[PDB]
Design a protein around this ligand. Structure first.
Ligand SMILES: *[C@@H]1O[C@H](CO)[C@@H](O)[C@H](O)[C@H]1NC(C)=O
Ligand SMILES: O=C(O)c1cnccn1
Length: 515
């Protein structure tokens, strides 16, 4: 194909504008995923209780601390309990002579009158709106899992649709569905409905990701292609910083979700001015429409020689693309061939670890340190040099040691974060930030390495299985957080162990650098 791009302009004004336009959309798309660090933050809470919260009652001389100690019992954090209150005010507990056996469990009851939440950091969150606390606490990671399952189902449905209807049509309607479903999720009347709309938003997020990447690859001349995928990968890195920047200003979840959704109406509107993939159009037997797209890009780039193209030249020079329809293949072909079984297993395990680890950790920053705005910023700011350093080492050291060292770095940081005591919040923050940086570098490595481990007709299928395994692992990410009832060390032990085991597995892969 590339000779037509050479004649039309292989990296010109059009590709520059298109790359910028698609990067910006990927930034906002990243915010949609990272949002529920802030949209679903857990403010500290207690039961509603008469002496504290009944402002219509008769006045009293006692200070707030005394009233609180008189009304809500102590809990595991050496602080007021978040799910229980005294059945009647424990005036006896005010005296300095008091002891812990002055009351018993029979003196307590659950939050019959509901909960009171701290409004100092966030004005509202879904947790505060629908009381996703105490016996309902599991519903938050469930909501996150339903979103990520939406991405899996959407990626599965995108393939057939992308090949049947085209790259740009599916991209356009995905932008529209993101705008509409995000706006609808902002105004959901009940929690099940919020889950439904987040699922339907995720279904479209998958389409935007896949077709953004594909539509760049089908319009970029090969000499510039690695750079374009690098910039595409940096879009997510800038998205983390943008999430922190937006969420620091908009402290109200409905307004925050709406604010990050509205941009996709503009993305929808400008996706009509992009061209459809010329490869796809010729492959599907529509060469006159392909000629229109090619002459349009030539007009934007300013090449005078647009007269040199004809549908005969297109059909002659793109026949080697058209011929690709001859040979279908299946995922079983990866496991039937005696040697490729081992490569497939280990490669797929690496793809899983990035998904399981990244979306396990990056969606509960509130557990990693004292300030979640700076944490969300830094898992972008560190992501940038991690990705660039990964490319450098991946060029000079080879694929195998770079992937292995990256995953082991991630795993050992996350595991060390179990041992560092809760007093040292800054060091805990730093270790978790470095862990997520290593996970990003590992994503960079495995994307490239999986494109080299396999014979060229199975290459696409191997990467496809890998990406669907990453998406499938992301679903299990948040669910593993439910193990926290046994202590916060256990979820972190799992999130740390998976990348160590897969890193040591990657050491068994064969090196693919030419020498
Ligand atoms: C709140 O205080 C008013 C004072 O008149 C009282 O009538 C009402 O029953 C109280 N309600 C609760 C739940 O304490
Ligand atoms: O590079 C990243 O951070 C990334 C890429 N695709 C999906 C999720 N995350």
């Amino acid at each position: 194909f590339s000779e037509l791009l050479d004649l039309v302009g292989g990296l010109g004004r059009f590709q520059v504008l298109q790359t910028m336009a698609l990067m910006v959309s990927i930034m906002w798309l990243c915010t949609q995923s990272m949002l529920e660090n802030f949209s679903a933050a857990v403010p500290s809470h207690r039961c509603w209780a008469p002496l504290l919260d009944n402002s219509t009652a008769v006045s009293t001389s006692l200070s707030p601390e005394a009233l609180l100690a008189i009304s809500i019992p102590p809990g595991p954090n050496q602080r007021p309990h978040q799910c229980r209150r005294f059945r009647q005010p424990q005036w006896q507990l005010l005296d300095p002579n008091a002891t812990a056996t002055s009351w018993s469990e029979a003196d307590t009851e659950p939050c019959v009158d509901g909960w009171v939440y701290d409004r100092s950091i966030f004005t509202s969150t879904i947790v505060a709106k629908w009381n996703l606390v105490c016996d309902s606490h599991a519903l938050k990671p469930m909501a996150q899992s339903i979103y990520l399952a939406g991405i899996l189902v959407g990626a599965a449905a995108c393939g057939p649709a992308s090949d049947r209807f085209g790259r740009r049509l599916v991209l356009t309607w995905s932008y529209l569905q993101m705008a509409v479903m995000g706006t609808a999720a902002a105004f959901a009347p009940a929690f099940p409905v919020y889950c439904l709309f987040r699922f339907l938003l995720a279904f479209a997020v998958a389409g935007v990701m896949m077709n953004t990447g594909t539509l760049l690859m089908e319009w970029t001349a090969a000499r510039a292609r690695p750079l374009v995928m690098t910039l595409n990968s940096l879009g997510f890195s800038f998205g983390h910083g943008l999430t922190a920047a937006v969420a620091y200003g908009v402290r109200d979840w409905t307004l925050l979700q709406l604010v990050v959704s509205v941009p996709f109406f503009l993305c929808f509107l400008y996706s009509w001015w992009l061209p459809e993939s010329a490869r796809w159009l010729i492959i599907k037997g529509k060469p006159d429409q392909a000629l229109q797209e090619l002459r349009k890009v030539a007009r934007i780039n300013g090449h005078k020689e647009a007269k040199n193209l004809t549908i005969e030249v297109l059909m002659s020079s793109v026949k080697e693309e058209v011929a690709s329809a001859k040979e279908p293949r299946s995922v079983l072909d990866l496991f039937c061939v005696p040697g490729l079984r081992f490569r497939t297993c280990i490669s797929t395990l690496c793809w899983f670890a990035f998904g399981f680890t990244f979306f396990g950790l990056a969606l509960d920053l509130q557990a990693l340190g004292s300030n979640i705005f700076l944490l969300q910023m830094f898992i972008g700011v560190v992501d940038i040099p991690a990705k660039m350093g990964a490319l450098l080492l991946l060029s000079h050291l080879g694929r195998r040691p770079t992937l292995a060292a990256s995953l082991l770095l991630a795993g050992l940081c996350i595991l060390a974060n179990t041992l560092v005591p809760h007093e040292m919040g800054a060091l805990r923050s730093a270790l978790a930030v470095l862990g997520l940086g290593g996970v990003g570098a590992a994503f960079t490595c495995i994307t490239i390495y999986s494109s080299e481990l396999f014979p060229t007709v199975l290459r696409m299928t191997a990467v496809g299985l890998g990406q669907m395994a990453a998406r499938g692992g992301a679903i299990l990410g948040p669910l593993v957080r439910l193990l926290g009832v046994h202590g916060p060390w256990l979820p972190l032990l799992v999130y740390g162990t998976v990348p160590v085991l897969s890193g040591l597995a990657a050491l068994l892969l064969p090196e693919t650098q030419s020498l």
